[PDB]
Design a protein around this nucleic acid. Structure first.
Lengths: 125, 266, 63, 213, 102, 102, 143, 277
RNA sequence: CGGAAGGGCACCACCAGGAGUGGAGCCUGCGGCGCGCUACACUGACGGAGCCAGCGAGACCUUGGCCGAGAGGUCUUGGGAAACUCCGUCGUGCUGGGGAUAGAGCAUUGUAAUUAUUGCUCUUCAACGAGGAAUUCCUAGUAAGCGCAAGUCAUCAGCUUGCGUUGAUUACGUCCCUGCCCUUUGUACACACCGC
């Protein structure tokens, strides 16, 4: 069957399922193109991974993201995390782990919360 | 991190941590920024061992696919790694690659030593590794004892910034025509122990201070290190001591300003 | 006005100084020798650069 | 002479991606509108505290900058400015609105003076941070003022605070709006106009220090 | 800087089998599990042979002229080595379990 | 692609293909007198009957980017420089012309 | 190659379709469009009284088609915002069901929608085709 | 992998003769680790060792030029294909995909090497120009230009020293870090056929069509040995242990092997080239 | 009984800032004291548009249909929050911020006293112009803003307690002041340090 990988991103209480499969190069969120995320100032906050890594990878890859829960900001952060994780998972499973490591290095160099969640667990003095 | 850290070590300068997790990736963090400077995968460059009582292969099992022991080098540039596997892998930090991989023991009695079996028991494992604070050797404590790898052979032509006119014969001619500074510089440019030794024991006392004054700052560390590793097992004490006193006198402030570079030398 | 730059070298602890104000030793950036004991107000740490309107004066304690 | 070819099929995506988006690819800007290169801190002693090195698209990183003691110094300067902006009773917790304000302010700075919004911001901050200040020595009851220096992080904090309060004060009850008043404040501050609230206050602080040093 | 040779083995000064003295009597050869440790007595030093075997060494012997070293593990696998260079010359396979060499 | 027309307390921006009221300016108190674009095609300046001109960016009527007070007499004509980007000229009923920098 | 409002933005599509309905004309607006209030929680009628009814109709079509079938009560729940009762804290207020139903009846009379079993209001095939046509129009609106 | 057709002849015939070859062991049994560049072919093949089979990757040059040279990186992930038209393509071996492409020589690229550190890469072609690239980034560090066309390049990664066999009958030893000629070995009276470094990096063995095999001591920069063989040596290599010399001549199916007395003892270093000859 | 020396800790202290109460309206606990909620607008208001949560499961809710501006009533089915954001109107005037109160009208609830309560609509536009003296509270998903749900033996119904959403500035040092606490037989075990 078709190559497919599935990842999860999670901000405060926002979950984002990211499905990645080999396809024509379309990025849809909630059945709409990614160019129409809601808050419209954080459109680039969610464009981050694409412009961080380049796009030809996305030209070969097809991406689908479903979000539920959280606010606007939390949902946006969940979306970007889900895309980053899913992209690296796909590159790990179906293409060279050399490029896997280049992707992971670029993401973590830019902003690590693209990959590992920032679980804000409390602090008592 | 992404999974169970189980080994840790720290840059000698005191700025970074290197942590090996259970995926077999040696991540490296900057402390004050609490951020990830970079990680080194290790999953593929590990020679695990098969077990005669196993039902599966020596590749597709994660029996020892990770490193339970990490340590830095004393220039902060290299890492030694060892685990329950059969391999001791020597990576280097700043460029995220491996320099070497040693196999701890070929002994089919020890369990995880055959990669393919030839058609409870002692296993082989490296419990803990360290470099040497003299940074010419490192030790690995394993099921069979304390192995100690070293470099004290120096059978190797590792020159440095040579040029066409720097030859051993030219060095001898420099000695005969009494440019001791030039002879020493050329000796290090060649970087050969016997030639270094010859010129070093050739130059005279009433001229050691001038040479120590005029040695270039690139060669201060190499000369200090050589003097130390020679003066341990050499019998010309005040030769070595006049040399060291002249060196410290001529160039002390430089060493104080870059202490971390002359660590092993001092 | 001619101002001067300096680099902090050591924060001086255990001197009894008024809260918020901190002792500090600086060495001038221009010439690396000469050093002055100044006072600072904000959060200060080692090896940062600090601006002096005056070079001559040296801070004393502030009770 | 020498070239490297990295892209081989021209990039097309099933989802249309705007052209300004591909230019943002070519080099990260701010708001997809302004580059960080040639943005230098015209004043020593304060670089390595006011940070514009690593690029950023919108000033909305959620990084933890209040844990340790100088992660503020590691914050990007624009996000610090917007956070300080979103500070008053009716303002708390609207970072999106603060971002909108900062964007319009940057646009207005370019429109008025052509040079660079971010360079203007950095220049204004460096120029308006105070340099000496007087603590209140009790003297056992003889309350006087003593002149001391001020650390770079305090200089930056106070520069931002002065600018933000100045804009809010000057647009509190006035036909102007916060965006344009902030632009006016920033431009005059870069000028060192002495007609801006920030420069006036800095001069007063430094004058008091000069007096009773 | 990135080259390391196995230069020493610490712990387990004797594991199994024959112990021998060198011609000059200045050196004691001991078999450790796979390899052979040389203890130089008068100069107070040690040393361990780089080559290993396949199983535990079962017997050793040193040529009287202090040149050759035969070492046999538990299955006739025998390695004949030089000293004055410390290299493996040959390795033959005596098919039955050896018990002693001289 | 656009042009500005003065009217009663009202400045109207029209397009070329559409030829429709694109932008509305009504923040004046009395009837406007002069309207002029800048060389960069961003700022339009209007001289009103209050003797205080208002210049602000096009396509943003909801901002009075600048309100410059001329003589008390109503201002008649207001123009940008062509070669220069940041100088303005005005004339009012005070029979005096005023050159203004931003 | 086949697009939809799923691929078009919201506000641009709503404005374009409202303009299309203005120009088309046959919508049969009610007579009291210029006095009606649109919500009991609101406190002054819509500003653009000339076509706010058309904007509501277009937004209703978008909502139904993004969804699949919606009642007048569901529309009222969706549209009705919160009020300001003053000294006391606020509470949620529904929308104007009357306006919602004149919108819904007008869309049925036009033929944009069809009726929906299990009770409900669904999008008609012809209305769907015209919606895709206008979505493509506003996509290639960029010439 | 696509499952598509291969368009070709219905009967089996072997590949053209193998001209160039490179091999690494760092990742055996996990994917391909040999590149072979075939004679008069516009693409090189991958070979897998532990599987003892031809792998599933073919490496094109995208420049319509025959593959004059190949190499492969110490990490085992990158393989380089240097065309006859100056195209230095860089491929990723796991997925056989294309990653990069360099264009500096306009003549045929006759040798590629990448450091044992995956930082610097050195290229050498017939036009007489050597190009020091960075590989982590994608820039050009420097560009030297020797006198005559370069025949071949052997890289020694322990000491960052690589030797170029030229056409004016010389070997030139150049070190990569400081980017300049350190040694210049003269003496071969005829075309130089093959040459190689010692594992300790102190010797170069060079065999040339005067039926001669010489060994040069690098430090003194002088020929310490010269052997007159009857059949010219068409290839020569050391074992990683410096104790075997494997040479291949022009007649005979075999591969002559040599032991290393200098391994088992010392050897004087006196230049004797013309002394015998 | 007192003094000295040394060391520690604290938003009852220093230092930097933030946010309140106290002014006005409203609610209500202690009897003048005190706690909540709404205001004083342009970082707004107003109008169209966009939509993103989680806790909660003992004649009732309701999906849908019909009319009614609204409130609401009528016929059928079973046991998706606000702040927010996008465009548009308004402009500094106690004005459009503020809706007290007053008048009139429209429906619902019980019931019969033309009794009371609730909701909607018109018109009426008050005080309030950022709150003195003082004073308290506060260091990270913290101050503060915003809505939602439940009343699970106490306490709470113009209120308690949960849950979700948005999310900062300034200290993170110092014993200088204000306090408070400890020590003045190393007791224990190398090295060093100290020495009534």
């Amino acid at each position: 069957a078709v190559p497919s990988v599935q990842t999860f991103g999670k901000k405060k209480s926002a979950t984002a399922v990211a499905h990645v499969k080999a396809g024509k190069g379309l990025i849809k969120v909630n059945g709409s193109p990614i160019t129409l995320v809601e808050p419209e100032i954080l459109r680039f906050k969610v464009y981050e991974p694409l412009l961080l890594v380049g796009l030809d990878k996305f030209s070969n890859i097809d991406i689908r993201v479903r979000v539920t829960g959280g606010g606007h900001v939390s949902q946006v952060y969940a979306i970007r995390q889900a895309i980053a994780k899913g992209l690296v998972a796909y590159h790990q499973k179906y293409v060279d782990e050399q490029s896997k490591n280049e992707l992971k290095k670029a993401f973590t160099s830019y902003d690590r919360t693209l990959l590992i969640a920032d679980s804000r667990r409390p602090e008592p003095k | 991190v992404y999974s169970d850290v189980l080994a840790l070590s720290m840059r000698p300068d005191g700025k970074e941590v290197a942590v090996s997790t259970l995926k077999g990736q040696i991540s490296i963090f900057n402390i004050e920024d609490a951020k990830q400077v970079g990680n080194i995968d290790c999953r593929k460059d590990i020679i695990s061992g098969r077990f005669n009582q196993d039902r599966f292969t020596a590749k597709n099992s994660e029996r020892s696919k990770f490193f339970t022991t990490i340590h830095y080098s004393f220039d902060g540039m290299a890492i030694v790694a060892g685990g329950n596997n059969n391999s001791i892998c020597l990576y280097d930090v700043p460029n995220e690659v491996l320099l070497k991989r040693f196999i701890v023991s070929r002994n089919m009695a020890l369990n995880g030593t055959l990669e393919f079996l030839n058609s409870m028991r002692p296993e082989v494992r490296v419990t803990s590794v360290q470099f040497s604070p003299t940074a010419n050797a490192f030790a690995a404590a394993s099921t069979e004892g304390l192995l100690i790898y070293s470099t004290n052979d120096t059978i190797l032509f590792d020159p440095f910034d040579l040029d066409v006119d720097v030859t051993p014969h030219s060095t001898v001619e420099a000695l005969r025509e009494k440019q001791f500074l030039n002879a020493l510089v050329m000796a290090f440019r060649l970087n050969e122990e016997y030639l270094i030794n010859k010129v070093y024991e050739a130059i005279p006392i009433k001229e050691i201070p001038l040479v120590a004054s005029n040695i270039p700052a690139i060669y201060l560390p190499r000369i200090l290190k050589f003097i130390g590793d020679f003066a341990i097992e050499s019998q010309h004490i005040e030769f070595n001591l006049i040399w060291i006193k002249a060196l410290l006198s001529a160039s002390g402030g430089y060493i104080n300003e870059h202490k971390y570079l002359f660590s092993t030398a001092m | 006005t001619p101002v001067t730059l300096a680099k902090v070298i050591k924060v001086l602890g255990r001197t009894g100084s008024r809260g918020g104000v901190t002792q500090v030793r600086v060495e001038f950036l221009e010439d690396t020798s000469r050093t002055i004991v100044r006072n600072v107000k904000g959060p200060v740490r080692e090896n940062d650069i600090l601006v002096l309107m005056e070079s001559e004066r040296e801070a004393r304690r502030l009770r | 002479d020498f070239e490297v070819v990295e892209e081989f099929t021209p990039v097309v995506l099933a989802t249309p991606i705007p052209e300004e988006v591909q230019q943002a690819q070519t080099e990260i800007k701010l708001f997809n509108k302004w580059s960080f290169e040639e943005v230098e801190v015209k004043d020593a002693s304060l670089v390595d505290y006011v940070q514009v090195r690593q690029p950023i698209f919108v000033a909305h990183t959620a990084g933890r900058y209040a844990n340790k003691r100088f992660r503020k110094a590691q914050c990007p300067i624009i996000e610090r400015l917007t956070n300080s902006l979103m500070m008053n009773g009716r303002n708390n917790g609207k970072k999106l609105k603060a971002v909108r304000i900062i964007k319009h302010t940057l646009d207005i700075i370019n429109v008025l003076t052509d040079q660079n919004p971010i360079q203007v911001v950095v220049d204004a901050i460096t120029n308006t941070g105070p340099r000496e200040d007087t603590t209140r020595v009790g003297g056992g009851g003889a309350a006087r003022r003593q002149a001391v220096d001020v650390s770079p992080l305090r200089r930056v904090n106070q520069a931002i605070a002065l600018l933000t309060i100045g804009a809010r004060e000057a647009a509190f009850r006035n036909i102007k709006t916060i965006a344009e008043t902030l632009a006016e404040e920033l431009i005059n501050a870069a000028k060192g106009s002495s007609t801006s609230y920030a420069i006036k206050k800095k001069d007063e602080l430094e004058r008091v220090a000069k007096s009773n040093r | 800087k990135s080259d390391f040779k196995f230069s020493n083995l610490l712990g387990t000064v004797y594991r199994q089998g024959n112990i021998t003295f060198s011609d000059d009597g200045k050196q004691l050869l001991s078999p450790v599990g796979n390899r052979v440790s040389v203890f130089d007595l008068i100069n107070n030093k040690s040393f361990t042979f780089e080559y290993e075997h396949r199983k535990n060494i079962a017997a050793i012997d040193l040529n009287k002229q202090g040149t050759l070293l035969i070492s046999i593990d538990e299955d006739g696998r025998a390695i004949l080595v030089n000293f004055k260079a410390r290299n493996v010359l040959h390795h033959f396979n005596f098919k039955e379990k050896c018990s002693a060499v001289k | 692609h656009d042009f500005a027309v003065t009217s009663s307390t009202r400045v109207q921006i029209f397009s070329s293909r559409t030829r429709q009221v694109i932008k509305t300016f009504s923040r004046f108190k009395d009837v406007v007198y002069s309207a002029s674009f800048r060389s960069d095609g961003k700022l339009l300046c209007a001289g009103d009957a209050t003797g205080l001109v208002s210049v602000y960016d096009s396509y943003n009527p909801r901002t009075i980017l600048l309100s410059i007070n001329a003589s008390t007499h109503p201002t008649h004509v207001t123009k940008f420089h062509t070669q220069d980007n940041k100088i303005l000229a005005t004339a009012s009923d005070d029979r005096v012309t005023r050159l203004w920098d931003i | 190659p086949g697009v939809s409002v799923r691929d078009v933005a919201a506000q641009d599509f709503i404005n374009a379709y409202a303009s299309f309905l203005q120009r088309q004309g046959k919508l049969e607006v009610p007579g009291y469009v210029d006095i009606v209030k649109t919500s009991s929680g609101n406190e002054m009628p819509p500003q653009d009284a000339e076509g706010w009814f058309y904007k509501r109709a277009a937004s209703v079509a978008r909502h139904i088609y993004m969804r699949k079938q919606v009642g007048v009560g569901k529309l009222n729940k969706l549209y009705g915002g919160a009020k300001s009762r003053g000294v006391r804290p606020y509470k949620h207020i529904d929308a104007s069901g009357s306006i919602n139903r004149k919108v819904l009846q007008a869309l049925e009379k036009i033929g944009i929608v069809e009726i929906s079993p299990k009770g409900g209001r669904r999008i008609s095939e012809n209305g769907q085709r015209d919606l895709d046509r206008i979505a493509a129009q506003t996509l290639e609106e960029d010439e | 992998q696509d499952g598509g057709r291969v368009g070709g002849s219905t009967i089996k015939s072997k590949f053209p003769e193998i001209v160039a070859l490179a091999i690494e062991n760092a990742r055996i049994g996990e994917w391909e680790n040999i590149i072979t560049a075939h004679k008069d072919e516009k693409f090189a093949r991958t070979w897998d060792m532990r599987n003892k089979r031809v792998g599933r990757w073919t490496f094109d040059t995208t420049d319509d030029g025959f593959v004059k040279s190949v190499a492969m990186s110490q990490c085992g992930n990158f393989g380089f294909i240097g065309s006859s038209n100056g195209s230095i393509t860089i491929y990723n071996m796991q997925s056989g995909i294309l990653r990069k492409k360099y264009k500096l020589h306009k003549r045929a690229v006759t040798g590629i090497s990448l450091d044992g550190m995956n930082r610097k890469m050195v290229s050498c072609g017939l036009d007489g120009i050597v190009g020091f690239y960075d590989f982590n980034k994608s820039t050009l560090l420097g560009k030297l230009k020797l006198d005559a066309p370069i025949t071949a390049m052997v890289y020694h990664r322990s000491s960052d020293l690589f030797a170029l066999a030229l056409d004016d009958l010389s070997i030139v030893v150049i070190d990569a870090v400081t980017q300049r000629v350190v040694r210049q070995l003269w003496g071969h009276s005829n075309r130089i056929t093959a040459f190689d470094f010692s594992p300790e990096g102190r010797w170069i063995v060079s065999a040339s069509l005067d039926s001669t095999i010489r060994t040069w001591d690098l430090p003194t920069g002088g020929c310490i040995d010269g052997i007159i063989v009857d059949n010219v040596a068409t290839n020569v290599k050391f074992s990683p242990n410096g104790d075997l010399l494997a040479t291949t001549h022009v007649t005979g199916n075999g591969i002559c092997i040599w032991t290393n007395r200098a391994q088992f003892k010392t050897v004087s270093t006196r230049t004797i080239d013309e002394s015998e000859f």
